[PDB]
Design a protein around this ligand. Sequence first.
Ligand SMILES: COC1=CC(/C=C/C(=O)OP(=O)(O)OC[C@H]2O[C@@H](n3cnc4c(N)ncnc43)[C@H](O)[C@@H]2O)=CCC1=O
Length: 529
Amino acid sequence: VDIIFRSKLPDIYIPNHLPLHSYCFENISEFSSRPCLINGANKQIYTYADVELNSRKVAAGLHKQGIQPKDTIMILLPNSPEFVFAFIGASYLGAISTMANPLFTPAEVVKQAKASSAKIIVTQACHVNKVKDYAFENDVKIICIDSAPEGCLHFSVLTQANEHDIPEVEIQPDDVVALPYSSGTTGLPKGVMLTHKGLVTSVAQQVDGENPNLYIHSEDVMLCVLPLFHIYSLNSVLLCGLRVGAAILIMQKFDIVSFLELIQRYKVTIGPFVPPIVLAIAKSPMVDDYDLSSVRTVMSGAAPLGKELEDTVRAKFPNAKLGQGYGMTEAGPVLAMCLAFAKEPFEIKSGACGTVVRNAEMKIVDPKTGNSLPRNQSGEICIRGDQIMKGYLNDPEATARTIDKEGWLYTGDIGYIDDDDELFIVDRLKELIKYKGFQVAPAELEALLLNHPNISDAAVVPMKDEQAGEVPVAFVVRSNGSTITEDEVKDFISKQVIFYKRIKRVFFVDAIPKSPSGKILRKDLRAKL
Ligand SMILES: COC1=CC(/C=C/C(=O)OP(=O)(O)OC[C@H]2O[C@@H](n3cnc4c(N)ncnc43)[C@H](O)[C@@H]2O)=CCC1=O
């Protein structure tokens, strides 16, 4: 029998039959006039009423541009009001948003645009060159938020539209609404189909209930420095923030001065961070010149924090509950959330990544045997519930390998649950690398390396790094007669990928350590490092 773990919080009613917009704005009449988005770039503020209305106008605009239910748009933007209006606008149409880093190479963007079948790309003028040729050849519309080059439209063509021109649509709970890309537990980035039902469930698991797991309310100011094109910010900052009527303070990029100035000046109360931000707070000499006493909740996720740094950063935020959460794109994303964040808080231990969310089930499985494990025994973390993905777009094989027929998602993370129902992550079984919380899929990098005519074999694995948590390093087997150097390998990769995917070290070997069956012994390579 599977040994099943659940939250210390009771299950709640979740209205996951509601479309995401209908759910997120369900209580909007209670905070219509309250600030919703604050753009750190220009200090422009949109109220809840403004955001709902602009989203509805954009929906009508998108429909006029040809977006039908189940069509997809690509958002290729930094954190911005336009990101939000495009995402929620598509939701109103029963359509799908795929989201991508605007700093991706042209090849990276176009690959995602093709895989997702994006009909419209929403971007900035400076990035039009990345997609222009592709878009022209395939009649994909380009909409720019600042200025529109030839063959492009301005975003105002969407906001000029009449909100009463949203077509009648029957959106189903299992309809897809968000399509972030993720490599999962092996291989290349794949399209994660997140549904109305799934996202409503995940948001509710965090912020709903008499005692919510993550207590946020309409007088909070939540910093949105994490990128909305990644699932952490999209779900736990934007969608959760909207649900409870909180103000969301948008930053386009991390800048330590801007970060501190904004926290102090806007009296930020919720700080959704990642470990490298926590590291910057612990290291920077200017932090002591700032008043950060407004912050009541500091969250870290996406990568391990580690007891030491966690304990330390409580000093810089004297009034804050500090804790970790644990997410994975395929999981909706939140698997576990710190119960110190609850309206009626629980005791926690440093180094834990939370307690499994309510209205969900977790098990811990020995990778060697397939047997479920009891408390205080490490194995592969698995979760099930209505919050998880529908599956991978056009990839039933990858879906079948990732979620079993009993509904269990296998995370590829190794951890244990203690006597207090706190989850601790101790290792990663899957090949995924995390650079500052960003996904780096070794399979992508290995594919590039293998296609170099002077490389015979390659393996990319994480190396521990203070600043980034992990950096990608490559083990390379040179082809016969090859003289390719570490720098030449690095440059070859550097010219083809976004900065965070860059190989930081190259180690040249006679053979890649492989199992008898020829699978890369990634754990062995990690051990060598
Ligand atoms: C504050 O808590 C929250 C966290 C997240 C994390 C999302 C994420 O990272 O997804 P993805 O890019 O697919 O990568 C998923 C993989 O990242 C690792 N990871 C994640 N959180 C941790 C952690 N606290 N400790 C150690 N490792 C971790 C782990 O390997 C996981 O499978 C979302 C929302 C949220 O509220």
